[PDB]
Amino acid sequence: QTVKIWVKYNEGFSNAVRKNVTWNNLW
Amino acid sequence: PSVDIDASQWQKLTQSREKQTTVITPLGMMMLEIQGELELPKDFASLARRDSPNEGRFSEQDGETLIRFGSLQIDGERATLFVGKKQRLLGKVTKLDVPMGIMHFNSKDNKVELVDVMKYKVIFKDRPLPIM
Amino acid sequence: SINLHSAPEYDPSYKLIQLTPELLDIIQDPHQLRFKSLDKDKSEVVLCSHDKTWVLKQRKHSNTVLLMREFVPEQPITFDETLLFGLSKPYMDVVGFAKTESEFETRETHGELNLNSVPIYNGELDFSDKIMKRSSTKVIGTLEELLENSPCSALEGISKWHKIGGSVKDGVLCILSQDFLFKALHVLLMSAMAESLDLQHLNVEDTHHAVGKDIEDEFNPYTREIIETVLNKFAVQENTWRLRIPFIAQWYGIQALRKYVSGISMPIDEFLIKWKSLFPPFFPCDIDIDMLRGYHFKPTDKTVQYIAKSTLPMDPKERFKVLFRLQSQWDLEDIKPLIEELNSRGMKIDSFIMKYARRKRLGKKTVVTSR
């Protein structure tokens, strides 16, 4: 009934394609 | 537009301080990486109300309610992460290929500060084990 | 052990940037790094030192990354620990203040100039016309304004400005046309000898005076700004300028090749004469066919003919085919500039050539020929 805390494991790892950056993506 | 990166604050604290090993950065920061999602409750306020001092899961710091979600034990280079009551994850202290700047982007002023520089991380890639 | 805490809200104003060795060193120097962009919603963001430019890219990933900081608890953090094993007593507390799902990657890039409202000057006076029949209405008056609106560093920008022959007229930045640039060089050179100026140590004032002292001003386009441009193109300064004589000789030679040996070949020593004649008289330089490597080939060993690299086939086996067809035996460094572009897998350049060509020794010297 009290707090439940855990890691839901990912079976592996995905790195997406790199993307351009706008001035607004920083602020 | 344009703006400079202010690294003034960081450079003085890097002189008023001393040590990296790893441990933590001298400025008191660290980078934690996990292959998975960390599932915390959606509503801290509700669960904090209900919080035993035996569980010790919630505390107030500087106007914020913080959940205590785990413990980290370093022995190498080797590292162990306890999450919640029922999970153990085995990991590694890794030196970064490319150091990472933590920069703070203050949108009000469109100004940017160097907060710290991360050279090590502690990472957990493997399935969580049952406790002990 | 370390107690791990998390806030209910992360702050996304905290972001991770790659600090490559050079960027890292600058960040520890002891405001030398700058972010720049043409606009707020569209264009690339670049990161500049005084001297270099990086482009930013962002790459999302699938893991959890928490940035955590040491904090001092207001009250001691007490709880029942229920197991022993492999967990020492807490000695500090950290809190996750940011959670990042991507990195901003920083990659070396070639700085460039933003040349948009900037006209070509050819240039008759009454430049007012070309100023008012332009793209924008807004004027870029200063090089600083130009640089501020450019994806490049201060020094990269200044250097490109000098190399493309940037100038200013009537308070309006402009770029000199190839013809007028070349003509301006010719007149500056003529005048400098006529007044016995030190070509190793020229300055704007004396050189300007030398050019226009016997010309009526309203018919003189060679303003101080034009003279400075020509010096920054064809000379090196340091505060005086030093003429780049080989560069200048090559510049004339390339024109000569185009004029005299475009569709046709000519004996080398007879070509040299014609090349020499384009110079203004008494211009101190000893000219040599090897200054024109990359711009000619030798149908026979005692003839010369012009070539534009841009006409060559793009596939390197085809390129080597066409060159050996034009000339059977090549001195090694005659042929290197005509094929370097195709060396994409950055091989050592003489290995790249032996892939498509054969070395052959005649007398003392070493030539190259087809395999």
Numbering used by the authors:
A (entry chain C): 714 to 740
B (entry chain B): 2 to 133
C (entry chain A): 2 to 31, 35 to 242, 248 to 380
Paper quotes:
RFCCtf18 is a seven‐subunit complex formed of Ctf18, Rfc2‐5 and the stable Dcc1‐Ctf8 sub‐complex. RFCCtf18 is a variant replication factor C‐like complex, the basic function of which is to load or unload a DNA sliding clamp in an ATP‐dependent manner 19, 20. Previous studies have shown that Dcc1 and Ctf8 are able to form a stable sub‐complex in vitro and that the C‐terminus of Ctf18 is required for the interaction with the Dcc1‐Ctf8 sub‐complex 39.
We identified a construct that expressed well in E. coli that includes the last 76 residues of Ctf18 (residues 666–741) with full‐length Dcc1 and Ctf8. The overall structure of Ctf18C‐Dcc1‐Ctf8 is extended and looks like a “hook”, as the C‐terminus of Dcc1 folds back towards Ctf8. Ctf18 binds as an extended peptide to a conserved groove present in the dimer interface of Dcc1‐Ctf8. The extreme C‐terminus of Ctf18 forms a short helix, which is partially buried in a hydrophobic pocket of the first “barrel” of Dcc1‐Ctf8. The structure shows that W736 and W740 make crucial contacts with other aromatic residues of both Dcc1 and Ctf8 as well as the extreme N‐terminal proline of Ctf8. The N‐terminal section of Ctf18 in our structure forms a beta sheet with Ctf8, with E724 from Ctf18 forming a salt bridge with R128 from Ctf8. Residues 666–713 of Ctf18 appear to be unstructured, suggesting they form a flexible linker between the Dcc1‐Ctf8 module and the rest of the Rfc1‐like domain of Ctf18.
